[PDB]
Amino acid sequence: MIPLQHGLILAAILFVLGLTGLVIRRNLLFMLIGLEIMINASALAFVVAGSYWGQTDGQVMYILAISLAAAEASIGLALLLQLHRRRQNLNIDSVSEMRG
Amino acid sequence: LLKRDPLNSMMNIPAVLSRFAGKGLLLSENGYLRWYVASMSIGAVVVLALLMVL
Amino acid sequence: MTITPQNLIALLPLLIVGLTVVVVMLSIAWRRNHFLNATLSVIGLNAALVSLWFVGQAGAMDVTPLMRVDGFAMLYTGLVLLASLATCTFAYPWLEGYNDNKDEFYLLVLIAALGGILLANANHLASLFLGIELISLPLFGLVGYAFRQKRSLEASIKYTILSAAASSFLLFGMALVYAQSGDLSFVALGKNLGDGMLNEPLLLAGFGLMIVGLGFKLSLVPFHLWTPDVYQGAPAPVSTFLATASKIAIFGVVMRLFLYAPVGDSEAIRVVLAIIAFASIIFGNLMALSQTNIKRLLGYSSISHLGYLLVALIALQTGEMSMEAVGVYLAGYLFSSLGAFGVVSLMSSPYRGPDADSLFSYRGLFWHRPILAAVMTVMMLSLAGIPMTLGFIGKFYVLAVGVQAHLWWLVGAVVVGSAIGLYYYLRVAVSLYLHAPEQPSNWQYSAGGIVVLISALLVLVLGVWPQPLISIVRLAMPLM
Amino acid sequence: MLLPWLILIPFIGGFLCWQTERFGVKVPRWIALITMGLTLALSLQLWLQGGYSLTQSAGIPQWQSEFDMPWIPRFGISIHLAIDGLSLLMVVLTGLLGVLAVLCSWKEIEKYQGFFHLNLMWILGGVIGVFLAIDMFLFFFFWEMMLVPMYFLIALWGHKASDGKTRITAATKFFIYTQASGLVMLIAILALVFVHYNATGVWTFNYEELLNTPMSSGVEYLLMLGFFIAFAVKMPVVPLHGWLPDAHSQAPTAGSVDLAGILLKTAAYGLLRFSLPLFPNASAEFAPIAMWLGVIGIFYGAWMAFAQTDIKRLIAYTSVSHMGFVLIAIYTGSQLAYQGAVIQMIAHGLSAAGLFILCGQLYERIHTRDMRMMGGLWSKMKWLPALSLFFAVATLGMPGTGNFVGEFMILFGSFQVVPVITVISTFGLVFASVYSLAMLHRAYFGKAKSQIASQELPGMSLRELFMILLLVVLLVLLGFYPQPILDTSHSAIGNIQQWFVNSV
Numbered sequence A: 001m002i003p004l005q006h007g008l009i010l011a012a013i014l015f016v017l018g019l020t021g022l023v024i025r026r027n028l029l030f031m032l033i034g035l036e037i038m039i040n041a042s043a044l045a046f047v048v049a050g051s052y053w054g055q056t057d058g059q060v061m062y063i064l065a066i067s068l069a070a071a072e073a074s075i076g077l078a079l080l081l082q083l084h085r086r087r088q089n090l091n092i093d094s095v096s097e098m099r100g
Numbered sequence B: 001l002l003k004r005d006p007l008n009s010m011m012n013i014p015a016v017l018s019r020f021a022g023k024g025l026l027l028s029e030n031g032y033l034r035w036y037v038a039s040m041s042i043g044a045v046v047v048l049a050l051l052m053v054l
Numbered sequence C: 001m002t003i004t005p006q007n008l009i010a011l012l013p014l015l016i017v018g019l020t021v022v023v024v025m026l027s028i029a030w031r032r033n034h035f036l037n038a039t040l041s042v043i044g045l046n047a048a049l050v051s052l053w054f055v056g057q058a059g060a061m062d063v064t065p066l067m068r069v070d071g072f073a074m075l076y077t078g079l080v081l082l083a084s085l086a087t088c089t090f091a092y093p094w095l096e097g098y099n100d101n102k103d104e105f106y107l108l109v110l111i112a113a114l115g116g117i118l119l120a121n122a123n124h125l126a127s128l129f130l131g132i133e134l135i136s137l138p139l140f141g142l143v144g145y146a147f148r149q150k151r152s153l154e155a156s157i158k159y160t161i162l163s164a165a166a167s168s169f170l171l172f173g174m175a176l177v178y179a180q181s182g183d184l185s186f187v188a189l190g191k192n193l194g195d196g197m198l199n200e201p202l203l204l205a206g207f208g209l210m211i212v213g214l215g216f217k218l219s220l221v222p223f224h225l226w227t228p229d230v231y232q233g234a235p236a237p238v239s240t241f242l243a244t245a246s247k248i249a250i251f252g253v254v255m256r257l258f259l260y261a262p263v264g265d266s267e268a269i270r271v272v273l274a275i276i277a278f279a280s281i282i283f284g285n286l287m288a289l290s291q292t293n294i295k296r297l298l299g300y301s302s303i304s305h306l307g308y309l310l311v312a313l314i315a316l317q318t319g320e321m322s323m324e325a326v327g328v329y330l331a332g333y334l335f336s337s338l339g340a341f342g343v344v345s346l347m348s349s350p351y352r353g354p355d356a357d358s359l360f361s362y363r364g365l366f367w368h369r370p371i372l373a374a375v376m377t378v379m380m381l382s383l384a385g386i387p388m389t390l391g392f393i394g395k396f397y398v399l400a401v402g403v404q405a406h407l408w409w410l411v412g413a414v415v416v417g418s419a420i421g422l423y424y425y426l427r428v429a430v431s432l433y434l435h436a437p438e439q440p441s442n443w444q445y446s447a448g449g450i451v452v453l454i455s456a457l458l459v460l461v462l463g464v465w466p467q468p469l470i471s472i473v474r475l476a477m478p479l480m
Numbered sequence D: 001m002l003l004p005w006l007i008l009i010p011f012i013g014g015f016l017c018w019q020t021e022r023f024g025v026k027v028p029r030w031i032a033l034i035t036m037g038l039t040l041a042l043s044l045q046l047w048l049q050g051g052y053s054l055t056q057s058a059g060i061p062q063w064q065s066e067f068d069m070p071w072i073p074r075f076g077i078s079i080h081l082a083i084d085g086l087s088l089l090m091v092v093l094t095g096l097l098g099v100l101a102v103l104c105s106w107k108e109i110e111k112y113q114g115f116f117h118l119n120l121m122w123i124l125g126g127v128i129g130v131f132l133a134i135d136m137f138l139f140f141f142f143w144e145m146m147l148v149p150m151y152f153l154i155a156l157w158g159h160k161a162s163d164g165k166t167r168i169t170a171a172t173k174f175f176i177y178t179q180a181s182g183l184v185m186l187i188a189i190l191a192l193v194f195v196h197y198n199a200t201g202v203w204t205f206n207y208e209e210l211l212n213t214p215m216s217s218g219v220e221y222l223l224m225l226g227f228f229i230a231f232a233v234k235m236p237v238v239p240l241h242g243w244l245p246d247a248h249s250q251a252p253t254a255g256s257v258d259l260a261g262i263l264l265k266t267a268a269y270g271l272l273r274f275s276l277p278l279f280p281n282a283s284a285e286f287a288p289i290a291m292w293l294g295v296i297g298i299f300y301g302a303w304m305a306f307a308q309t310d311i312k313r314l315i316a317y318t319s320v321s322h323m324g325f326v327l328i329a330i331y332t333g334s335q336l337a338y339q340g341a342v343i344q345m346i347a348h349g350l351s352a353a354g355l356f357i358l359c360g361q362l363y364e365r366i367h368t369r370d371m372r373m374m375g376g377l378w379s380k381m382k383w384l385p386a387l388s389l390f391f392a393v394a395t396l397g398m399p400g401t402g403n404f405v406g407e408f409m410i411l412f413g414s415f416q417v418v419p420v421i422t423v424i425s426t427f428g429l430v431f432a433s434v435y436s437l438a439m440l441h442r443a444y445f446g447k448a449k450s451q452i453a454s455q456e457l458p459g460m461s462l463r464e465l466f467m468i469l470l471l472v473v474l475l476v477l478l479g480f481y482p483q484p485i486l487d488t489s490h491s492a493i494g495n496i497q498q499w500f501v502n503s504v
C-alpha cells in the first residue's frame, strides 16, 4: 500500500537534482557529489522496483550499484587530488585545452 | 560568360556546404566538461521526448 | 541455478583471464618486472583465445541466469581478446619510456578484457551493467595512466565524469525497465506486454535512458562530444583499446539486447535509433573534415563507423543477415583501427616524458618509415570503404542490409558520409606520401610492427577474398 | 579461358615492373613493354579466332568466350568474364593505348619508375576487367579499383609546375566524384539483386540472370537512375564533368597517364551493356532527358573548349563534347546510331590520345601550356605542328578520319529517330570546327607571343614520331575502311538494340 509510482517519482526527483548539481557547478568536488547523488538515486529506483515485485534482484542490483559507486568515487577523488596537486584549483572550466 | 565553368561551381556547392556544416558542428567541441554533461542531458531529453511522442 | 563442470568449461576465457589477473597481481607483489608481467598477461590472453576452441566444442547454452554462451559470444570474445593482445603489444614499447610503475597497465588491460568477455557472454541486465563498468573503470585508469601529462589527466577527468554520468543514466534505465517488466533477463523485457501494447511508456523511458548510456559508450550523437578529446589525450595503446575493444563489446551486448528483447521490435525505438544513426554518420564525417590531428580524426571516424553499425542494427528484426553484417563489419573495423592506432602507437613510442608534446606529424612518413606508411595508408583506404579492403566488404554488408530493410534515409546517409570520409582519409594518405621538412631497436617494437603488418595483410586479403571471414561469421550464430 | 589471363597479365606485369626495379632503372620499362605486347597480342588473337564477322545476332546473352569461377558464394558472386565483339574491340583499344602509354613514358628515369609502371599496369588491368566482367559485383569492383592508382598517379606524380595542393585537390575531386557515383551504382545493383531475389529466390549477381526481373515502373526508373548517375559521372555528362578537365590539367606531364585511365571509354560501354538491357523501359522513358543532356553537353563542351587558355583543358572539353554525341547516340534504339557510337568511341580514343601526346611533347619543348604564351610554332618545329593540325582536323569530324564516320552514322540514326536533337548536334559540329580552328590559330599560327616560342625547338624523337604516325595511320584507315570494326561489333550491337526495342 505504498505505490511504486511514488517511489519511482522520488528516485527520478533525486536523479534530476543530482544531474542539475553536476551541470551547474564548476567545482569538480560538487560534480563528484552530484554523480554520487545520481547513482544513489538509480540504486534507490532499483530498490523500489525490487520491493514492488517482491524480489531480491533489486537489492542485488543495489549492491552492484554501490560497488560501482564506491569505486568511481575512489577514482574520481584520486583524479581530483591530482588536479588540485598540479593546478591548485578545482575549476573544471580551466581544464578545457583540447577542443575542436 | 561560361569561361568560369558555372556547372562545375554549382556541383562544387555541396563541398562548400559540407565545409560550412563541419565548421558549425565543430563549435560543439569546445572542450568544456560541463557542456559535455549538458549535451548528454539534452540528448537524454530529446530521446525521451521522441520516444514519448512516438 | 547450480554450476556444472560443463558450465565451467563454457566459462573458460572468463576463468583464464581472471586467473591471469590474480597471477599478474601476485607477480607484481613478488617483484616489479615489466617483461615478466607483460609476458604473463599476453600468455593468459592467448590461453583464453585458444580455450575458445574448447568453448566451441562444449556447445552453446545458458551458463547462469546471467550468461549465455553461443557462437556470437565466441566471436565477440575473440575480437575483444585480439584487441587486448594488440593493446599489450603496442603498450610495451610505449611503457618502456615510462618512468613510473609500468606493471599496473597490463592488470588494467586484463580487467578491461574481462569486462569485454562479460559483455560478449551477457544475457542479463545485471551482466550488461557489470560488463560496462568492468570495461569503463580500467579505462579510467588507462586513459590517465600518464597523469603527470596535462592532456592525459584532462582526458581521464572527462572520461571518468561523463562515464559515471552515463552509468547512472543506464542504471536508472534498467531500474525503470525492471519496474515495468519484473525480470532483468533480456528475453523477458516486454514479454508481459501483449495485444500491440509493446510501446509501454515506462519501458520506453527505461530503454531511452539505457540508449543514452550505451550511446555514450558507442560514441553516438549527441553523446559523442567526449570522443575526440578522450581519444587524443589518452596514451596511444589506450586509444587503440578504447577504439576497438570497448566499442566492439558494447555493440555486441547492444546487439544481443535488441535481438533477444521483444521490445527491440518497437517502432519508436527503431525511429530513435535511425535518427541517432543518421546524425552520427553525418556528424562524425563532417567534424573530421578539417582535423589536423590524427587522434581526433580517428575519434570522429569511430563515431561514423558506429553509425554504420547502428544502421546495420536497426534492420535486426527485418533481415536475418544483420548479425552477419555486424560481425563482418566489426572484424574489418577492428583490423583497420588496430593498424591505424598501432601506427600511431609505434610512432609515439617510447613515451618521451610528460612535459613533451606527443604530436604525430604524419607528413612525409614514407621517407623514413616506409612499411608503417604503407600499413597506415592501407588502413586509411580500408576505413574509407574503398574496394580491395575489408572495410569495403563491411560497408557493402551495411548497404545490403539497409537496402533489404528499405532504410533509404540511412542508405543516403551512408553514401554522403562515405564521400566525406573519402575526402579526409585520402587527405591523410597523400599527406603520408608527401615530403617532410624535418622529424625501436628491440624485438617488442618489431612485434608491434608485425602486428600492424598482419593487420594490413588481413585487410587486403579479406578485401579481395572475404569468403573465409563470411564463413567464420556465419559459424557465429546465437540462440534462437 | 584467355580472359583471366587478359586481366591478370597487366597485374603480374606491374608487380614484375615494381619488383625488378632493383636490377636497374631502365629495366621496368621493358617489362611493361612486353606486358602490354602480350596483352595486345592476346586481344588480337581473340579477335582473329572469335569469328566476329560471321557471327549472327542471337539475343542477349551471346558471348564469344566465357569464364566462370566462384568468388563469394554466399551472395552468388563469381569472377564471371565474357567477351563479344564490343568488349573485344574495347579491350583491343585499351591494349593499344597501354602500348602507347608504355612507349610515351620511355624516357622517365625517376627514382620510383617501378611503382609508376605498377600503377599504370593496374589501371589498364582494371579497365580491361571493366570491359570483361559480366558479374555486377565484379564489374563494380573493377570500376572502383581503377581509381586508386589513378588517384596516386595524379596526386604524387602529377603536374610539377603546379603546386602539390592543386594536384591533391584535383585528384581528390576526381576520386570523390567517381567513388560517390560508384556507390550509387552499388546501391542500384544491390536493390536490383534483392528485387530479383524477392521475385524468384536465388542469390545471383550474374548479368544474364538479372536480365529477366519483374519490376514495377518506378523501381526500374530508380535503378536506371543510379546506373546513369555512375556512368554520367564517368561519361562525362554535364554538370558532372569538371573532374575531367581538373584531372587532365594536373595529370603527370608524360602524357601516358592521360592515355591510361583518364580517357573515357568505359561509361558508354556500361550504358550499352547494362543500362539498356537491364532497364529497357526506364531507358526508353529517360531517353528525352539523356538526349537533351547530350545536346547540352555538346554545346557546353564546345563553348568551354573555345574559352580555354590551356590546351590540355581544351582537349578535355573536346572529349566532353564528343562524349555528349555518344550519349545522344546511345538513347536512340538505332543499330546505325549504335555502330556509329562504337566507331566514334574508338576514333575519339585514338584522336584524343594523339592530341594528348602532342600536347605533352609540346610541353617538354616549351615548358608552358598557355596558348597566350605561344604562337607561330609552325616555323619553330619540325613534326609537331603538322601532326597537331591533322589531329585537330580529325577531332572536328573531317572526312578521311574515323571521327567523321562515327559521328555521321550517329547523326544518320538519330535523324531517323529524332530530328531536332540531330540538327542541334550538327550545329554542335559547326562549334567543334570553331574551337579546333581557334586552338590551331592560337597555338601554331601567327607570331611569337613570348620569348620561349621565338627560338628554334628540338625535333621530336623517332619513337614518339613513330607512335604518333601509327595513330595517324590508324585514324585514316578507320575513316576510309571502318568495315572490319563494324563487322566485329555487329552482333553485340544487334543484340543490344533488339533487346532494347523488343521489350518496350
Ligand SMILES: CCCCCCCCCCCCCCCCCC(=O)OC[C@H](COP(=O)(O)OCCN)OC(=O)CCCCCCCCCCCCCCCCC
Residues within 6 Å of the ligand: C406, C408, C411, C412, C415, C416, D184, D187, D188, D191, D195, D198, D214, D215, D216, D219, D222, D223, D225, D226, D229
Ligand atoms: C546522394 C546519393 C545517395 C542517394 C540516396 C540513396 C538512395 C535512395 C533510394 C530511394 C528509394 C526510394 C523508394 C521509394 C519506394 C519505397 C516503397 C515502395 O513502394 O517500394 C516498392 C518495392 C517494395 O514493394 P514490393 O512488394 O517488394 O515490390 C517489388 C517491386 N518490384 O521496393 C522494392 O522492391 C525495392 C525498391 C528499390 C528502389 C531503388 C533504390 C535505389 C535506386 C538507386 C539510387 C537512388 C536513385 C538515383 C540517385 C538519385 C539522386 C541522388
Ligand SMILES: CCCCCCCCCCCCCCCCCC(=O)OC[C@H](COP(=O)(O)OCCN)OC(=O)CCCCCCCCCCCCCCCCC
Residues within 6 Å of the ligand: B011, B012, B014, B015, B016, B018, B019, C289, C415, C416, C419, C420, C423, D169, D172, D173, D176, D177, D180, D181, D229, D233, D239, D240
Ligand atoms: C546533378 C545532380 C544529380 C547527380 C548527382 C550525383 C552525385 C554524385 C557525383 C557528384 C559528386 C560531387 C562532389 C563534390 C565535391 C568534390 C570534391 C571537391 O570539390 O573538393 C573541394 C574541396 C577540397 O579542395 P579545396 O577547395 O582546396 O579545399 C581545401 C579546404 N581546406 O573539398 C573540401 O574542402 C571538402 C570536401 C568534402 C567532401 C566532398 C563533398 C561531398 C558531399 C556529398 C556528395 C554526395 C552527393 C550529394 C548530392 C550532390 C548534389 C546533387
Ligand SMILES: CCCCCCCCCCCCCCCCCC(=O)OC[C@H](COP(=O)(O)OCCN)OC(=O)CCCCCCCCCCCCCCCCC
Residues within 6 Å of the ligand: D427, D430, D434, D437, D438, D439, D441, D442
Ligand atoms: C547566313 C544567314 C542565314 C543563317 C544560316 C545559319 C547561320 C550562318 C551564320 C554564319 C556566320 C559565320 C561568322 C564567322 C566569323 C568568323 C571570323 C571571326 O569572327 O573571327 C574572330 C575570331 C577569331 O578567332 P580566334 O582564334 O579567337 O582569333 C584570335 C584573334 N582574333 O573568331 C571567333 O572568336 C569565333 C567566332 C565563332 C562564330 C560561330 C558562329 C556560329 C553559327 C551558328 C549558326 C546557328 C544557325 C541557327 C540559328 C538559329 C535559327 C533559328
Ligand SMILES: CCCCCCCCCCCCCCCCCCCC
Residues within 6 Å of the ligand: C373, C374, C375, C377, C378, C381, C386, C387, C388, C389, C433, D112, D115, D148, D156, D157
Ligand atoms: C586499394 C587497396 C590498397 C592497395 C595498396 C595501397 C598502397 C600501399 C602502399 C604501397 C607502396 C607505396 C609506395 C609509394 C611510393 C611513392 C613515390 C613517390 C615519388 C614522388
